[PDB]
Write a protein that binds this ligand. Structure first.
Ligand SMILES: Cc1cc2nc3c(=O)[nH]c(=O)nc-3n(C[C@H](O)[C@H](O)[C@H](O)COP(=O)(O)OP(=O)(O)OC[C@H]3O[C@@H](n4cnc5c(N)ncnc54)[C@H](O)[C@@H]3O)c2cc1C
Ligand SMILES: Cc1cc2nc3c(=O)[nH]c(=O)nc-3n(C[C@H](O)[C@H](O)[C@H](O)COP(=O)(O)OP(=O)(O)OC[C@H]3O[C@@H](n4cnc5c(N)ncnc54)[C@H](O)[C@@H]3O)c2cc1C
Lengths: 566, 566
């Protein structure tokens, strides 16, 4: 007898004994239960007080080596209760079995605590079912910070916000430790995260199996557990997610991709080296970053990462953030048909096929699209299947597969005598496509950040050459640094304006960064090649290829703003 | 019997009755007592939890019209116990007497609460002496946010930090109100602040008088109470101090100083209008802003305010933030002899005398300073007495009063034929001065922010003239806007770098803003005067007067940074 009543008397014997001991037949508790773990119904100070209170009640209930046995039992239960193939689960179990290390609550979450009706203090704790290590429960509580950005959150809640009032993981860890007495640093933390994620995956699989007599969430959980199983999680105190991702990006870059620059350049005059690097980056978790949902970071962190990966010429290819593909990916994901999404994006997010965005025709109503394209970047790749054309309120963009009859590449276009193997013309002669086959802010931001990174590398090279081999060169260096700093500041300001105050109130800054950057970057490239009297050739080629209506647009917007202000 | 024991049994009868009723002879309480109200011994979440807990214990002890009589009694007690002349106290009492509107604790502060030894929860509340309105106690608790930036904090603590973890005043107000049930908005809040400040001043005066049988703190408290007695304090929820100061600056500007522009310009070809405006600004509290201790704001708020007050040509004169005076004031305040400070700064902070910083000689050891100055700005003012000269590690700056024998102005220097009534040469022929009479970051930041504001006003004027009367003018407008945005971003970045990561790690950005701004601002002025084919004459004069070694310095620093990075 433990069901609801209008609680009950309530291995129920173990739970009853635990309740009796704690008191040294529980009735109803008149308190709240935050289903969503983001706590959106209170202020910031209230959220911080709530999390401090749960930390201290955990400490008070804890402070007042069969862990491997528990891991083995959970592995056996998950393997016996499994109903679908899951190599990730077996890999995670094998990896955790290679790692070794009281009265816990088993499933201590924010959803199993009833507070006071008018005050933020813990009144009672329930659901003490799987109770039998003084640090595993803390890891189970704190794992929700690393809930995968792709998997929807459990208990119908939003992902944990940052800079809102919630304590960061290190902050909560320090609170609990100082409440207990142990040192802030903790050992075998990767093992704790792996065990917690594996236990959660097993619980979800068991719940799904019981409901059959949650199902698709075991694979993302196992993948994330494997991803965090090989890292250095600093328990002691030290967006934060953006900084961690940027640090990992820099480490991966400096450890793998810079030494391959010479080999790639020699092969230029896609190699299997790029394929191996792509596989390594996908395995390490650094893949499809630029997608604003598969990675979860904010716009400013995106711009900083793009700046960090614009230095190498072919760097965006490794992270699957090429120039044409990302716009089509964003268009498909944001406002796209579910059937069209399943048909097309699945061949993009896995890197199966490329894409192309072309507007440099007739889209008259099925519908027929007869016209001639031009300057279509990335149209010559052997793995280029999809194609998005926004041709003639005549703006109607419709997908057109390149394998459809009537599509035929005409000739390759050369810029300054470089074929750009890493601009073939396209002709569409009355292609028949079904009706099923039928913004710029992030694109401009990333296209400016990459150019800024390129200019920074150019300045580094020019400074090194000037030192290795007068006042004029020093003046050139100083002017280049000034221009680089100003352009970076403008780009970051535009990105932050897009992030905070919507996306429709940042057209002015986008036009401004579209105007400012290329001129100064071309000037810097010219000064560098003049000082030289080498990778700089590729940088100059890119800067010249990437090189006055936007000034008129900015003037119109400025005049409108001045008229509005008065 | 209420003294300490190793508490006691403990109008003590009223306190004993209150304790007995609350329980329905208190012993010692084993808990902490935060003397400093900033709570520096805990983390951010712990601070937020502490303040939430004090808010809810206040609400629980309160929720579970003799206010004018109490005000009159406090006024009588303060007047009878007064020992020194205080017109501010009488003025505040008269102002409060014109404003009209349970079981309180009288002196409910963070210093009269004992928490738990290991948890952040309220255990007991003490010092219930003056207990007899359900909102006055809240105002007394929350007044500590407006502790004057000049008066040192009480109970030997630091001023309340921002963006640290402490709740903002509106946030705490909302917490307490939602705990009680009243609406977030509150009436007669200015009266509450005035009464709270007057009561605190009376308590301090009484404590000082009792100790004589705190003394100098009654005047700043009364002045601050008078200053906040005339404002609009929004109780409901809506740096914050920087934003409030900037809003007040903009309101004062647009309400008083812009209409006087025509009169001042006509008088040009200091008037009593400037004196009246200076008196009004000093009365309103907007005075000596640029001093980094008499105002208390951070560097970024300082730059934003300076940008807002750089638009009017003579605006810095009203706020007492002139170009030469502020450097000498900062040098005196930061590292200056107490005797020298009392001798000189007191004639500056009150606007009694001006100053001048001149280095464009011999300071050989008393000491004699014989040499010829040049381009000494502000040396012709009739109220110019002090003078700081850093002349010949020969850098030894020594104050030299201008009334001393041997100092005589030579001739006035004209720039472009403007005498600049709002540059006389100085000659020092063996001045005898005692040995008693013996950085650039804020100066450069403000000197760039004012120029940015001037450029913004110039662009506004040029846009208005272009509308009132082609593609080239539109292109000019767009380029001017781009340059203005880039320069503002650079200036703010340099100011923030000075603020956060010390003042010795921002020389590069300071040199960068010293290089970048004048060229673009001069170009904008040239384009404006070309479009015109008027206040713009004064703006061009200033921009030209304010107009290549810094490039070499920046190149040297950049080369050193590149060498260090490798
Ligand atoms: C490296 C590279 C990659 C490219 N990739 C792509 C791609 O992926 N997809 C794609 O669709 N296109 C692509 N393009 C083409 C790109 O769209 C063109 O550079 C651009 O659209 C101009 O094409 P256009 O010949 O129509 O310009 P035109 O209209 O022929 O050029 C007119 C020029 O005159 C000037 N001008 C315009 N209006 C005014 C005015 N009112 N007053 C004064 N001057 C004015 C401007 O300088 C303007 O560029 C690429 C080009 C390059 C060089
Ligand atoms: C409006 C105004 C207000 C002023 N107010 C003050 C004031 O309050 N206090 C004060 O002390 N002074 C003041 N001055 C003077 C100011 O210090 C001077 O403008 C400046 O110091 C230059 O003086 P100078 O004659 O010694 O320069 P000079 O040394 O005679 O000029 C040399 C010039 O050559 C160039 N140059 C220098 N080194 C190099 C190099 N290595 N390579 C190439 N070119 C180089 C630079 O353009 C430099 O300005 C003011 C000036 C003006 C115009």
């Amino acid at each position: 007898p433990t069901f609801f009543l209008q609680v009950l008397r309530k291995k129920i014997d173990r739970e009853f004994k635990i309740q009796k001991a704690l008191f040294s037949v529980m009735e109803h508790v008149q308190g709240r239960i935050f289903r969503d773990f983001s706590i959106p119904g209170v202020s910031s100070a209230e959220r911080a007080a709530i999390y401090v209170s749960v930390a201290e009640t955990l400490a008070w209930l804890h402070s007042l080596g069969y862990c491997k046995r528990q891991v083995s039992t959970w592995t056996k239960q998950y393997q016996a209760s499994a109903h679908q193939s899951i190599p990730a689960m077996d890999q995670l179990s094998t990896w955790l079995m290679k790692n070794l290390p009281c009265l816990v609550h088993g499933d201590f979450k924010l959803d199993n605590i009833v507070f006071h009706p008018k005050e933020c203090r813990v009144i009672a704790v329930l659901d003490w079912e799987l109770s039998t290590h003084p640090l595993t429960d803390l890891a189970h509580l704190s794992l929700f910070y690393y809930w995968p950005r792709t998997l929807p959150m459990i208990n119908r809640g939003s992902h944990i916000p940052e800079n809102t009032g919630i304590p960061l993981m290190e902050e909560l860890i320090s609170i609990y430790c100082h409440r207990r007495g142990i040192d802030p640093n903790l050992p075998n933390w990767n093992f704790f995260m792996a065990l917690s994620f594996f236990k959660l995956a097993g619980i979800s699989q068991g719940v799904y199996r019981r409901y059959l007599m949650t199902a698709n969430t075991v694979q993302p959980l196992a993948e994330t557990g494997l991803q965090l199983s090989k890292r250095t999680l600093r328990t002691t105190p030290p967006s934060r997610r953006g900084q961690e991702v940027l640090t990992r990006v820099k480490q991966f870059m400096k450890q793998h991709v810079f030494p391959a620059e010479k080999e790639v350049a020699e092969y230029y005059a896609h190699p299997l080296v790029i394929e191996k690097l792509k596989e390594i980056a996908k395995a390490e978790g650094l893949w499809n970053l630029f997608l604003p949902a598969v990675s979860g970071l904010s716009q400013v962190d995106y711009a900083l990462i793009a700046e960090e990966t614009g230095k190498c010429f072919f760097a965006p290819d490794v992270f699957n953030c090429q120039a044409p593909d990302t716009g089509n990916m964003e268009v498909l994901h944001l406002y796209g048909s579910e059937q069209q999404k399943k048909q097309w994006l699945e061949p993009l997010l896995r890197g199966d096929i490329t894409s192309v965005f072309c507007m440099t025709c007739t889209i008259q109503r099925g519908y027929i699209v007869n016209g001639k394209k031009w300057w279509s970047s990335g149209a010559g790749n052997p793995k280029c299947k999809i194609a998005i054309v926004l041709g003639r309120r005549q703006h109607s963009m419709i997908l057109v597969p390149m394998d459809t009859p009537g599509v035929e590449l005409i000739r390759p276009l050369s810029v300054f005598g470089y074929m750009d193997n890493m601009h073939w013309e396209v002709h569409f002669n009355h292609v028949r496509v079904p009706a099923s086959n039928l913004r710029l802010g992030p694109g401009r931001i990333h296209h400016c950040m990459r150019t800024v990174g390129l200019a920074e590398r150019i300045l580094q090279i020019m400074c090194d050459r000037a030192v290795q081999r007068h006042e004029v060169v020093a003046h050139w260096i100083a002017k280049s640094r000034i221009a680089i700093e100003e352009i970076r500041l403008l780009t970051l300001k535009a990105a932050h304006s897009i992030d905070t105050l919507g996306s429709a109130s940042a057209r002015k800054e986008i036009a401004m960064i579209k105007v400012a950057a290329p001129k100064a970057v071309c000037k810097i490239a010219d000064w560098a090649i003049q000082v030289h009297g080498y990778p700089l050739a590729n940088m100059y080629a890119i800067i010249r290829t990437l090189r006055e209506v936007h000034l008129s647009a900015i003037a119109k917007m400025e005049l409108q703003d001045q008229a509005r202000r008065l």
